[PDB]
Amino acid sequence: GPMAWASSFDAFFKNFKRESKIISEYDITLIMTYIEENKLQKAVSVIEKVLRDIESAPLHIAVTGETGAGKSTFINTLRGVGHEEKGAAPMKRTPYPHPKLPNVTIWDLPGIGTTNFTPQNYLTEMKFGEYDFFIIISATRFKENDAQLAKAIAQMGMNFYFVRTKIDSDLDNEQKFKPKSFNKEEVLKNIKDYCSNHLQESLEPPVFLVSNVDISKYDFPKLETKLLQDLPAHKRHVFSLSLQSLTEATINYKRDSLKQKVFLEAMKAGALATIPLGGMISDILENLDETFNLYRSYFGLDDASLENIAQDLNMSVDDFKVHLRFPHLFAEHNDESLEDKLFKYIKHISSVTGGPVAAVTYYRMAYYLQNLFLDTAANDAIALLNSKALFEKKPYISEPPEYWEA
Numbered sequence: 001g002p003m004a005w006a007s008s009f010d011a012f013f014k015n016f017k018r019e020s021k022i023i024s025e026y027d028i029t030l031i032m033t034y035i036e037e038n039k040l041q042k043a044v045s046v047i048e049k050v051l052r053d054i055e056s057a058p059l060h061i062a063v064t065g066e067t068g069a070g071k072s073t074f075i076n077t078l079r080g081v082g083h084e085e086k087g088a089a090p091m092k093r094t095p096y097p098h099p100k101l102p103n104v105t106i107w108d109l110p111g112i113g114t115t116n117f118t119p120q121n122y123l124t125e126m127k128f129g130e131y132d133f134f135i136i137i138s139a140t141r142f143k144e145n146d147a148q149l150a151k152a153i154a155q156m157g158m159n160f161y162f163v164r165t166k167i168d169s170d171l172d173n174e175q176k177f178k179p180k181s182f183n184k185e186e187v188l189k190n191i192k193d194y195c196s197n198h199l200q201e202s203l204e205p206p207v208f209l210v211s212n213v214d215i216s217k218y219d220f221p222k223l224e225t226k227l228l229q230d231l232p233a234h235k236r237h238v239f240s241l242s243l244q245s246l247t248e249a250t251i252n253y254k255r256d257s258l259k260q261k262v263f264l265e266a267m268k269a270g271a272l273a274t275i276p277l278g279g280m281i282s283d284i285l286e287n288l289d290e291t292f293n294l295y296r297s298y299f300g301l302d303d304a305s306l307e308n309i310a311q312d313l314n315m316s317v318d319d320f321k322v323h324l325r326f327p328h329l330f331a332e333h334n335d336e337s338l339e340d341k342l343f344k345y346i347k348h349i350s351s352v353t354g355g356p357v358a359a360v361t362y363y364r365m366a367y368y369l370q371n372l373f374l375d376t377a378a379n380d381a382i383a384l385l386n387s388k389a390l391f392e393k394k395p396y397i398s399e400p401p402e403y404w405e406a
């Protein structure tokens with residue numbers, strides 16, 4: 001009933017990292033209020049409007065800094081674009097669209113130094129209101145011009161982040177200079193402290209030390225997390241989708257964002273009192289074909305993406321796929337029927353956010369099929385990060401999706 005529905009909605013969202021939740025805690029409170037008050041149409045109306053906002057949300061990122069700071073490489077790295085390809089970044093602001101997400105654009109802004117504007121006049125010239133946040137980039141030490149731009153951005157109620165690039169080169173130079181006494185943490189601390197302490201003379205700012213050529217190292221993961229934390233809840237979905245599938249943390253940000261979105265879609269469609277039947281499963285899988293291929297694209301599991309990984313393993317994409325779970329997820333194994341496996345899965349998924357006493361809330365079969373595919377795709381993408389080492393020891397290289405096996 002309504003109280004079971006509200007509690008299982010609450011239980012579902014409690015399982016996610018704060019920076020990953022695609023609805024706000026007020027959104028949750030209002031949906032729970034309406035459900036508990038039997039205002040079901042109002043609750044569905046909130047969910048519909050939340051989903052429309054999530055699906056239409058644009059993401060506009062301004063990247064500013066002087067020349068030689070790695071700005072073009074950073075803009076390309078953000079988008080997953082090779083330095084060679086069409087749309088790669090090599091006066092006036094220049095847009096760089098995301099290659100795979102229409103609503104996402106990274107803007108190359110000329111450094112305020114190379115102009116003669118005040119901070120406030122710089123912001124108005126570059127059209128400050130179009131952006132969700134600003135990245136201020138340097139490969140050295142940030143000039144007072146940048147502390148003043150940040151102060152101007154902040155006084156306008158927007159977010160900025162100082163990003164110090166080329167940290168890998170400075171570490172490499174120090175290790176070669178002082179191989180007996182090299183202390184990576186001391187170098188990083190000395191660089192961060194200098195930037196932080198000098199920027200503060202005009203502001204303590206978040207400073208992130210990064211290598212533009214490896215988004216998995218140094219402070220780049222902490223930067224992605226902070227950017228997620230600071231965005232409005234509804235924009236975290238498009239931001240998560242824009243990330244590279246290059247770390248476990250980023251794959252899981254995508255996995256968690258998509259799982260929340262399909263749960264909200266399930267809510268909008270309506271709770272069910274009984275487990276959905278399986279007589280039509282092949283037909284539901286067929287209706288979901290386009291969606292499953294979209295999910296494969298999000299996680300880098302489409303056939304074209306698998307080409308790169310299969311060659312580096314010196315094997316065919318086909319032999320590679322043998323050891324991934326998503327290709328035969330829905331195919332019978334061990335002479336167990338798919339609908340009997342799905343029935344056990346649904347009882348597991350529903351007792352997690354439901355417990356053993358309250359009435360159990362079920363959703364349409366398509367919800368469980370999408371949820372299962374997302375966990376499988378994400379687990380396959382994670383295994384891809386470490387496929388060489390996994391291949392040597394362990395028939396699938398990936399972990400099974402939660403609750404599917406028994």
Ligand SMILES: Nc1nc2c(ncn2[C@@H]2O[C@H](COP(=O)(O)OP(=O)(O)OP(=O)(O)O)[C@@H](O)[C@H]2O)c(=O)[nH]1
Binds near residue numbers: 069074165
């Ligand atoms: N090791 C390392 N190389 C980098 C990094 N950032 C950029 N590069 C390299 O530096 C070269 C380009 O240098 P820059 O001209 O200073 O930066 P850019 O990417 O061209 O962008 P601009 O700021 O407009 O000059 C390319 O070879 C990049 O591969 C970094 O963080 N680490």
